[PDB]
């Protein structure tokens, strides 16, 4: 079997209202990954086009790698899609975040073949998401491939899966790696080779049965445990369908060996040691590109999430790209993965929650980095049909993956005695005490109250955050949109949450600025600015380095306020962050004192006369900053 990438040069139309009978020579050319909302999804004004758009491409059978059956494979098509080959309506899909496939064989022909995909991201009441903050960028925003495979092949039609279910069970210093495969149109004479391989190639187990024994058990002696960032060891499982001696089909995946529990009082546990989960959420979009991300974009985000020392990532509010999950395995991050069951329960949305949950688990089951499954997000504020839906999903996730735990994110206002909170295995809350009213000191006591009233329900914070742009102040107060208040906000939240073992996970909202076309706030439109890093990933806000001081074992020092250069005071309050014991702040070469801090937030008092080149040393590490004295409060702040 071979794969034929089908990204290059599609004919696109926002104008057409019916699939073309014949290949348009008249349309606009796009390469995948593509989106028609990369521009009007990020400039605001609640105006981004939502509707049906059409893609059309021609491929010649003689140009494909040869196999007995042909599949179109979509890694991402937001939100709903209809596929046509040569005018024949082949399939239909609802869900912009999961992978799905269409068997082309009977409609393919010789000579030129016309493929048309009718993509739609319009409001309806059936397909989540519909009410949400983020922009639902329309279009084929991830890869499209043609799969050429034998008539006997590992399953390609069950909810986007591979037909490879690897389930490690750790037994003492050995692990038992159960391996189930699913086959389409297999025939009687066939056989199945199974192999696990080392991180450096070496074979580790192997079995071969006839095509009847779809389930096998292989064991690794002295297993190399995938154990978070510490040592994110990954094995590879691989299975080969063999007819006679030839290897006619093959399917592989990477995977990790670990156990984990969530203790209501002592937090999250990875392989029997307390492994506190302190991290961020992430959206799958970016300045300029919209949600049509390239592989280096996925890698750019990880490096910054990693440099900060996050240990967990909530991948809200939908299924992300496999290449992103793959990275999360490779670096040992602990993942929350969910479906867009968000904002408002839709009665005619039930069938679709079920399929996005089925797709989510089938396609991600082997990712050692996923430890929970998200049922919903901010789905209601009150104290019934919503309830039975939540049961179906929960029952489902447990019926399919009893090796992982269900969670959900609850809106701040929802009374903790709402029965639907009793459904998942764990719970987190989305609280903004200190941004949307309240004061930043309510967060710690709020989790204290949930823990008392419900001591057996592990409680987390799945969302918390505060907006920041390139505004500044020396009186930082909630609502001024300044980088300074966001530093303080997060300083305050870190002191209250990282110091409470029972909180099983904290997930900043959000790691990155992202596009929300309806918002008008801050001084830039259609943007949610609660990120720790800017939309184009090029700027790390000061808040980012507050978290580094607690989470990262890479030594560093960071002066805050580098962008607040002109200041109207006589002595100015410059915070510094570090994960070193003692830091010293210099003003034009003169020391101001050796301070030490338990919360890693060193505060300082700098006399502000003329130009003052500031320097901070902390062991090996050094960081420069500059300042000036004016009496006109510079109004670009
Ligand atoms: C991770 C995972 C992957 C699965 N992949 C397949 C598959 O590729 N093909 C298949 O027939 N069943 C697969 N299954 C099993 C089905 O879920 C199972 O047969 C189920 O009972 C079918 O019920 P349904 O028709 O309502 O989906 C998989 C199960 C899990 C947990
Ligand atoms: Ca817009």
XYZ file of C-alpha atoms and ligand atoms in Angstrom:
669
model
C 0.000 0.000 0.000
C 1.162 3.547 -0.798
C -0.167 7.042 -0.023
C -0.663 9.795 -2.594
C -0.881 13.257 -1.073
C -3.597 15.318 -2.759
C -2.916 18.836 -1.496
C -1.745 20.638 -4.656
C -3.871 23.090 -6.640
C -7.626 22.807 -6.080
C -10.164 25.005 -7.883
C -12.070 26.936 -5.213
C -15.329 28.882 -5.382
C -17.138 30.953 -2.787
C -19.519 31.925 -5.660
C -20.896 28.629 -7.007
C -24.188 27.284 -5.598
C -24.083 23.736 -7.023
C -21.268 21.244 -7.675
C -19.724 21.690 -11.135
C -20.726 19.060 -13.690
C -17.265 19.577 -15.311
C -13.879 20.821 -14.078
C -13.978 24.629 -13.803
C -11.272 26.450 -15.757
C -12.679 29.590 -14.194
C -12.030 29.250 -10.451
C -9.465 30.369 -7.889
C -6.540 28.057 -7.094
C -5.701 27.057 -3.516
C -3.263 24.571 -2.024
C -4.184 22.514 0.958
C -4.162 23.227 3.870
C -6.622 25.992 2.933
C -9.330 28.141 4.520
C -11.544 30.882 3.153
C -11.728 32.563 6.573
C -8.030 33.314 7.090
C -8.736 37.002 6.444
C -12.339 37.724 7.462
C -12.102 35.328 10.415
C -9.444 37.456 12.151
C -10.357 41.138 11.465
C -13.493 41.329 13.617
C -16.902 42.787 12.824
C -18.686 39.408 13.161
C -18.624 39.146 9.341
C -16.681 36.022 8.284
C -18.333 34.124 5.471
C -20.375 31.114 6.563
C -21.992 28.989 3.872
C -21.337 26.281 1.325
C -18.169 26.538 -0.778
C -16.876 24.159 -3.458
C -13.519 22.549 -4.222
C -12.848 20.740 -7.505
C -9.794 18.781 -8.617
C -9.040 16.364 -11.469
C -6.857 13.291 -11.056
C -6.031 10.661 -13.655
C -6.159 7.025 -12.538
C -2.864 6.421 -14.362
C -1.283 8.958 -11.973
C -2.123 7.224 -8.679
C -0.046 4.459 -7.089
C -1.713 1.215 -8.065
C -3.800 -0.784 -5.621
C -7.041 -2.698 -5.666
C -9.147 -0.058 -3.845
C -8.958 3.722 -3.608
C -9.883 5.920 -0.635
C -10.065 9.688 -0.252
C -8.798 10.609 3.234
C -9.643 13.943 4.906
C -7.583 14.971 7.927
C -9.679 18.103 8.517
C -12.721 19.558 6.709
C -14.636 22.229 8.625
C -17.417 21.754 9.242
C -19.611 19.555 7.047
C -18.768 18.069 3.667
C -20.260 16.249 0.672
C -17.905 14.330 -1.651
C -18.623 13.738 -5.361
C -16.654 11.718 -7.868
C -17.791 12.243 -11.475
C -21.177 13.634 -10.369
C -21.894 10.653 -8.070
C -22.655 11.660 -4.483
C -20.373 9.290 -2.558
C -20.576 10.281 1.141
C -21.382 12.980 3.721
C -19.629 14.035 6.905
C -20.432 16.215 9.934
C -17.493 17.368 12.035
C -14.622 19.678 11.231
C -11.983 18.158 13.466
C -11.887 14.362 12.933
C -10.432 12.300 10.096
C -12.769 10.443 7.738
C -12.629 8.467 4.523
C -14.612 7.702 1.396
C -14.190 4.591 -0.742
C -13.781 5.792 -4.352
C -13.287 2.451 -6.068
C -16.591 1.969 -7.879
C -16.822 5.602 -9.024
C -13.255 5.908 -10.258
C -12.819 5.413 -13.977
C -10.061 5.532 -16.556
C -8.829 8.776 -17.953
C -9.646 11.974 -16.127
C -11.571 11.775 -12.858
C -13.374 14.777 -11.344
C -13.469 15.131 -7.554
C -15.670 17.828 -6.034
C -16.009 18.454 -2.286
C -18.850 20.707 -1.118
C -17.712 22.179 2.245
C -20.156 24.063 4.513
C -19.665 25.942 7.813
C -23.121 27.517 8.169
C -25.231 27.767 11.287
C -27.403 24.765 11.948
C -28.721 22.862 14.993
C -27.194 19.448 14.368
C -23.392 19.701 14.149
C -21.281 21.054 16.989
C -19.778 23.653 17.426
C -22.406 26.368 16.847
C -22.181 28.841 19.746
C -18.603 29.552 20.724
C -15.858 32.132 21.043
C -13.446 30.885 18.353
C -13.953 31.342 14.599
C -15.250 28.242 12.758
C -12.863 28.639 9.803
C -14.409 26.885 6.816
C -12.551 24.798 4.261
C -10.341 21.770 3.813
C -7.841 23.010 6.401
C -5.842 19.750 6.799
C -4.275 17.285 4.360
C -6.224 15.249 1.819
C -4.706 11.968 0.652
C -5.556 9.166 -1.715
C -5.014 5.764 -0.127
C -4.278 2.879 -2.486
C -4.599 -0.404 -0.663
C -5.171 -4.088 -1.293
C -8.735 -5.384 -1.407
C -7.770 -7.092 1.882
C -6.634 -4.315 4.213
C -6.612 -3.083 7.787
C -9.906 -1.308 8.483
C -10.264 2.108 6.853
C -14.013 2.667 7.347
C -14.641 2.569 11.138
C -14.908 6.208 12.271
C -11.536 7.252 10.782
C -9.552 4.568 12.585
C -6.603 2.481 11.516
C -7.874 -0.817 12.809
C -4.983 -0.885 15.318
C -5.915 -0.867 19.036
C -2.828 -1.071 21.282
C -3.594 -1.333 25.019
C -0.594 -1.668 27.356
C -1.139 -3.077 30.840
C 1.812 -2.569 33.189
C 2.400 -5.576 35.484
C 5.368 -4.832 37.817
C 8.590 -4.339 35.791
C 6.966 -6.018 32.756
C 4.133 -4.811 30.511
C 1.503 -6.867 28.637
C 0.722 -5.128 25.322
C -2.623 -6.372 24.024
C -2.977 -5.763 20.283
C -6.289 -5.984 18.430
C -6.628 -5.390 14.685
C -9.737 -4.902 12.554
C -9.849 -6.070 8.971
C -11.946 -5.382 5.898
C -12.506 -8.016 3.208
C -9.852 -10.334 4.610
C -9.647 -13.787 3.010
C -9.023 -17.201 4.479
C -5.441 -18.045 3.544
C -3.975 -14.890 5.090
C -1.743 -14.324 8.125
C -0.917 -11.454 10.506
C 2.603 -10.621 11.729
C 2.804 -8.546 14.928
C 5.911 -6.718 16.126
C 6.774 -4.237 18.859
C 10.042 -2.388 18.360
C 12.447 -0.438 20.561
C 12.868 3.333 20.441
C 16.016 2.652 18.361
C 14.692 -0.129 16.119
C 15.340 -3.295 18.088
C 12.656 -5.955 17.984
C 11.057 -6.679 21.317
C 8.188 -9.099 20.686
C 6.546 -10.904 17.779
C 3.693 -13.299 16.976
C 2.103 -14.584 13.759
C -1.357 -16.105 13.490
C -3.780 -16.825 10.701
C -6.279 -14.150 9.803
C -8.742 -15.565 12.371
C -6.899 -14.424 15.522
C -7.485 -10.669 15.383
C -6.338 -10.295 19.032
C -2.850 -11.113 20.330
C -0.845 -10.442 23.489
C 2.831 -9.445 23.367
C 4.987 -8.776 26.445
C 7.993 -6.495 26.981
C 10.424 -7.494 29.697
C 11.879 -4.588 31.706
C 9.577 -2.138 29.980
C 10.816 1.433 29.401
C 8.001 3.431 30.975
C 6.732 6.544 29.166
C 6.965 8.834 32.206
C 6.048 12.418 31.252
C 8.685 14.991 30.409
C 11.171 13.144 32.642
C 11.632 10.356 30.089
C 8.904 10.152 27.413
C 9.919 6.755 26.069
C 7.823 5.571 23.122
C 7.543 2.069 21.648
C 6.174 1.266 18.199
C 3.585 -1.438 17.419
C 3.244 -2.602 13.816
C 1.080 -5.298 12.149
C 1.429 -6.796 8.655
C -1.311 -8.568 6.718
C 0.423 -11.210 4.598
C -1.150 -13.205 1.752
C 1.237 -15.981 0.739
C 4.676 -14.484 1.417
C 3.977 -10.946 0.259
C 3.099 -8.163 2.740
C -0.063 -6.777 1.128
C -1.102 -4.325 3.865
C 0.488 -2.876 6.957
C -0.480 -0.578 9.817
C 1.630 0.879 12.640
C 1.413 3.375 15.502
C 3.528 4.668 18.328
C 2.499 4.137 21.954
C 3.620 4.419 25.549
C 3.497 2.351 28.709
C 2.216 4.106 31.804
C -0.394 3.993 34.533
C -1.994 6.969 36.202
C -4.599 7.757 38.858
C -6.348 10.892 40.086
C -6.551 11.081 43.880
C -9.260 13.470 45.154
C -6.908 14.881 47.780
C -3.341 14.340 46.506
C -3.900 15.149 42.795
C -2.704 13.462 39.616
C -0.335 10.472 39.648
C 1.827 9.172 36.803
C 3.416 5.744 37.364
C 2.942 5.878 41.131
C 4.573 9.294 41.747
C 2.829 12.616 42.271
C 3.040 14.322 38.896
C 1.170 17.632 39.249
C -0.479 18.797 35.984
C 0.125 22.525 35.558
C -0.428 23.724 31.998
C -2.301 25.598 29.246
C -5.019 25.288 26.661
C -4.237 25.751 22.927
C -6.290 26.618 19.836
C -5.420 25.162 16.439
C -5.247 28.520 14.639
C -2.589 31.229 14.239
C -2.232 34.812 12.950
C -2.200 34.965 9.172
C -2.756 31.272 8.442
C -6.070 30.819 10.252
C -6.565 27.152 11.016
C -4.679 25.983 7.899
C -1.583 25.117 9.874
C 1.673 23.706 8.439
C 3.820 21.203 10.334
C 6.243 23.856 11.574
C 3.351 25.735 13.159
C 2.433 22.706 15.257
C 6.118 22.391 16.260
C 6.469 26.095 17.048
C 3.646 25.953 19.595
C 5.058 22.895 21.374
C 8.490 24.455 21.849
C 6.954 27.478 23.565
C 4.534 25.388 25.631
C 7.623 23.284 26.496
C 10.062 26.137 27.222
C 7.514 27.419 29.767
C 7.480 24.055 31.520
C 3.825 23.153 31.148
C 3.205 19.546 32.085
C -0.378 19.331 30.726
C -2.297 20.688 27.744
C -6.047 21.003 27.435
C -6.686 20.650 23.685
C -9.954 22.602 23.572
C -12.540 22.578 22.187
C -12.273 19.890 19.499
C -10.023 17.237 18.004
C -6.594 18.548 17.019
C -4.237 17.384 14.277
C -2.645 13.959 14.767
C 0.732 15.583 14.164
C 0.084 17.652 17.268
C -0.890 14.673 19.448
C 2.143 12.860 18.015
C 4.350 15.660 19.287
C 2.694 15.540 22.709
C 3.631 11.865 23.019
C 7.223 12.697 21.940
C 7.695 15.273 24.700
C 5.666 13.639 27.486
C 2.913 16.204 27.816
C -0.320 15.085 29.487
C -3.350 15.842 27.379
C -7.003 16.622 27.824
C -8.816 15.919 24.543
C -12.488 16.826 23.969
C -15.312 17.261 21.462
C -17.019 20.608 20.604
C -19.989 19.838 22.877
C -19.990 23.459 23.953
C -21.993 26.524 25.048
C -25.596 25.407 24.548
C -27.201 21.966 24.447
C -28.894 21.375 21.076
C -31.592 18.718 21.194
C -30.863 17.705 17.586
C -27.130 17.708 18.342
C -27.087 14.340 20.083
C -26.318 12.110 17.086
C -23.312 14.369 16.333
C -21.800 14.433 19.856
C -21.814 10.638 19.664
C -19.959 10.526 16.334
C -17.385 13.147 17.256
C -16.758 11.267 20.507
C -16.496 7.967 18.625
C -14.104 9.499 16.080
C -12.077 11.201 18.812
C -11.412 8.022 20.788
C -10.932 5.711 17.792
C -8.370 8.038 16.255
C -6.480 8.887 19.465
C -6.732 5.734 21.678
C -3.015 4.917 21.223
C -1.684 8.327 22.275
C 0.035 7.645 25.632
C -0.200 11.387 26.298
C -4.022 11.412 26.520
C -5.240 10.557 30.030
C -8.789 12.075 30.014
C -11.672 12.657 27.596
C -13.726 15.868 27.668
C -17.490 15.399 27.498
C -18.471 19.056 27.179
C -17.587 22.683 27.902
C -19.648 25.399 29.634
C -22.740 23.500 28.583
C -25.243 25.042 31.037
C -25.825 27.216 34.114
C -28.728 25.936 36.303
C -30.028 22.808 38.088
C -32.500 17.059 31.722
C -32.157 16.060 28.062
C -28.686 17.559 28.534
C -28.320 14.965 31.291
C -29.144 11.856 29.286
C -26.871 13.080 26.497
C -24.014 13.445 28.996
C -24.671 9.910 30.196
C -24.530 8.456 26.680
C -21.108 9.999 26.095
C -19.782 8.984 29.507
C -21.088 5.418 29.097
C -19.512 5.453 25.632
C -16.066 6.659 26.664
C -16.009 4.006 29.403
C -17.371 1.230 27.150
C -14.646 1.983 24.611
C -11.614 3.128 26.657
C -11.720 1.964 30.281
C -8.019 2.858 30.440
C -8.797 6.601 30.690
C -11.016 8.946 32.678
C -13.860 11.263 31.694
C -13.865 14.966 32.560
C -15.697 18.133 31.514
C -15.354 21.904 31.895
C -18.085 23.753 33.793
C -19.067 27.401 33.414
C -18.195 29.596 36.402
C -21.858 30.342 37.214
C -23.082 26.722 37.315
C -24.057 25.711 40.843
C -21.841 22.860 42.023
C -25.019 21.013 43.059
C -26.189 20.713 39.427
C -26.636 16.924 39.035
C -24.775 16.768 35.707
C -21.571 17.532 37.641
C -21.966 14.062 39.202
C -21.548 12.299 35.813
C -17.848 12.407 34.774
C -15.021 10.791 36.716
C -13.407 14.199 37.325
C -14.377 17.834 36.957
C -12.803 21.183 36.234
C -14.309 24.664 36.335
C -13.843 27.717 34.110
C -13.345 30.667 36.495
C -12.343 34.254 35.777
C -12.411 35.808 39.270
C -10.213 38.828 38.687
C -11.150 39.426 35.043
C -14.954 39.170 34.536
C -15.623 40.835 37.871
C -14.771 39.411 41.265
C -11.300 39.768 42.722
C -8.251 37.566 42.108
C -8.369 36.216 45.669
C -11.665 34.299 45.273
C -10.125 31.494 43.179
C -8.324 29.630 45.944
C -11.245 29.734 48.380
C -13.682 28.693 45.615
C -11.827 25.441 45.019
C -11.561 25.114 48.815
C -15.369 25.163 49.006
C -15.889 22.654 46.214
C -13.342 20.327 47.862
C -15.169 20.468 51.232
C -18.713 19.943 49.875
C -17.586 17.192 47.424
C -14.414 15.622 48.874
C -14.584 12.600 46.543
C -14.893 14.508 43.203
C -11.412 15.566 41.983
C -11.762 19.246 41.103
C -9.648 21.104 38.561
C -9.472 24.506 36.902
C -9.905 23.899 33.178
C -10.007 27.631 32.346
C -8.631 30.787 33.954
C -7.043 33.802 32.351
C -6.868 37.525 31.848
C -6.519 39.643 28.687
C -3.336 41.510 27.727
C -2.227 43.628 24.781
C 0.541 46.187 24.249
C -0.904 48.557 26.874
C 0.834 49.532 30.087
C 0.366 51.268 33.436
C 1.878 51.721 36.880
C -1.541 51.445 38.490
C -2.420 47.968 37.135
C -6.149 47.396 37.599
C -8.426 44.711 36.133
C -9.950 46.016 32.914
C -7.085 48.183 31.580
C -5.890 45.427 29.182
C -2.274 46.004 30.240
C 0.568 43.493 30.269
C 1.193 44.517 33.875
C -2.162 43.478 35.264
C -1.891 40.154 33.456
C 1.443 39.555 35.170
C -0.115 40.275 38.579
C -3.254 38.282 37.737
C -1.182 35.215 36.968
C 1.261 35.737 39.841
C -1.813 35.698 42.099
C -3.360 32.654 40.446
C -0.114 30.662 40.625
C 0.216 31.280 44.372
C -3.345 30.053 44.969
C -3.456 27.015 42.623
C 0.005 25.471 42.359
C 0.047 25.312 46.163
C -3.068 23.106 46.454
C -2.332 19.420 45.783
C -6.027 18.403 45.489
C -6.513 20.526 42.329
C -5.639 17.822 39.867
C -5.003 20.088 36.848
C -4.803 23.769 36.025
C -5.142 24.872 32.398
C -4.393 28.521 31.595
C -6.745 30.124 29.105
C -5.197 30.325 26.727
C -1.551 29.766 25.720
C -2.031 31.912 22.636
C -4.128 34.774 21.397
C -6.642 33.324 18.959
C -9.327 34.500 16.609
C -12.868 35.153 17.851
C -14.462 37.101 15.036
C -17.362 38.432 17.103
C -15.317 40.064 19.883
C -14.646 43.792 19.907
C -12.296 44.509 22.792
C -8.829 45.564 23.830
C -8.008 47.743 20.820
C -7.762 44.965 18.241
C -10.873 43.295 16.922
C -12.015 39.743 16.431
C -9.324 38.582 18.836
C -9.233 36.904 22.186
C -6.089 38.272 23.831
C -6.018 36.110 26.984
C -2.956 34.307 25.634
C 0.448 34.135 27.243
C 1.986 34.521 23.724
C 0.826 36.642 20.772
C -1.200 35.334 17.822
C 1.835 35.199 15.529
C 3.827 33.371 18.283
C 6.584 35.990 18.031
C 6.183 37.625 21.473
C 6.202 36.064 24.943
C 4.155 38.171 27.344
C 5.571 38.729 30.833
C 2.962 36.357 32.297
C 4.640 33.556 30.339
C 7.848 33.973 32.367
C 5.961 33.942 35.666
C 4.928 30.363 34.877
C 8.461 29.521 33.738
C 9.744 30.493 37.175
C 7.585 27.765 38.777
C 7.508 25.061 36.112
C 10.796 25.013 34.162
C 14.104 23.443 35.206
C 15.994 25.574 32.640
C 17.643 28.455 34.572
C 16.772 31.979 33.435
C 15.967 35.474 34.607
C 13.330 37.795 33.145
C 12.787 41.499 33.818
C 9.173 42.548 33.336
C 8.037 45.738 31.681
C 10.639 45.746 28.925
C 8.001 47.370 26.713
C 7.042 50.002 29.342
C 10.058 52.268 28.768
C 8.798 55.836 29.404
C 7.428 56.117 32.964
C 5.915 58.971 34.984
C 7.103 58.196 38.482
C 10.247 59.041 40.396
C 10.778 55.458 41.654
C 9.281 52.602 39.643
C 8.176 49.088 40.538
C 9.954 46.608 38.254
C 9.127 42.960 38.884
C 11.688 40.297 37.990
C 11.002 36.559 37.564
C 13.508 33.743 38.049
C 13.947 30.121 39.090
C 17.259 31.010 40.769
C 17.489 31.633 44.522
C 18.926 35.196 44.573
C 18.589 38.001 42.001
C 20.268 41.424 42.006
C 18.932 44.449 40.094
C 21.342 47.099 38.741
C 20.420 50.624 37.605
C 23.155 52.122 35.387
C 25.633 49.756 37.036
C 24.565 50.547 40.628
C 23.140 47.726 42.742
C 19.736 47.981 44.439
C 20.110 44.913 46.660
C 20.209 41.110 46.594
C 16.619 39.930 46.991
C 15.440 36.336 47.400
C 11.897 35.112 46.858
C 9.898 32.024 47.749
C 7.207 32.677 45.141
C 9.910 33.315 42.457
C 8.510 36.871 41.975
C 11.236 39.369 42.927
C 9.888 42.913 43.332
C 12.126 45.970 43.136
C 12.246 49.744 43.624
C 14.204 51.588 40.914
C 14.906 55.348 41.058
C 13.850 56.764 37.671
C 16.240 59.530 36.569
C 16.880 60.167 32.875
C 17.956 57.066 31.015
C 18.449 54.016 33.285
C 19.836 50.864 31.615
C 18.690 48.091 33.980
C 20.589 44.820 34.413
C 19.642 41.746 36.458
C 22.095 38.930 37.299
C 21.056 35.636 38.951
C 23.912 33.128 39.087
C 25.026 32.527 35.510
C 21.881 34.110 34.016
C 21.623 37.776 32.950
C 18.840 39.941 31.493
C 18.952 43.592 30.361
C 16.208 46.235 30.252
C 16.005 49.989 29.672
C 13.931 52.879 31.058
C 13.551 56.652 30.700
C 11.970 59.531 32.658
C 9.251 61.740 31.154
C 6.455 63.720 32.784
C 3.978 63.182 29.923
C 2.333 59.784 30.367
C 3.059 58.386 26.887
C -0.425 57.837 25.509
C 0.312 54.721 23.429
C -0.291 52.835 26.676
C -9.886 2.332 19.889
C -10.856 1.459 19.145
C -10.728 1.276 17.770
C -11.623 0.451 17.095
N -11.478 0.264 15.735
C -12.364 -0.542 15.061
C -12.213 -0.706 13.687
O -11.281 -0.128 13.106
N -13.107 -1.517 13.000
C -14.134 -2.152 13.689
O -14.936 -2.881 13.104
N -14.277 -1.978 15.053
C -13.401 -1.171 15.748
N -13.553 -0.983 17.113
C -14.616 -1.689 17.890
C -16.026 -1.168 17.840
O -16.087 -0.010 18.645
C -16.884 -2.301 18.404
O -16.906 -3.339 17.439
C -18.292 -1.847 18.807
O -18.906 -2.803 19.657
C -19.124 -1.556 17.555
O -20.326 -0.872 17.857
P -20.903 0.269 16.862
O -21.341 -0.334 15.538
O -22.078 0.993 17.516
O -19.732 1.187 16.575
C -12.658 -0.186 17.791
C -12.793 0.010 19.158
C -11.886 0.834 19.829
C -11.991 1.051 21.315
Ca -14.020 39.522 10.548
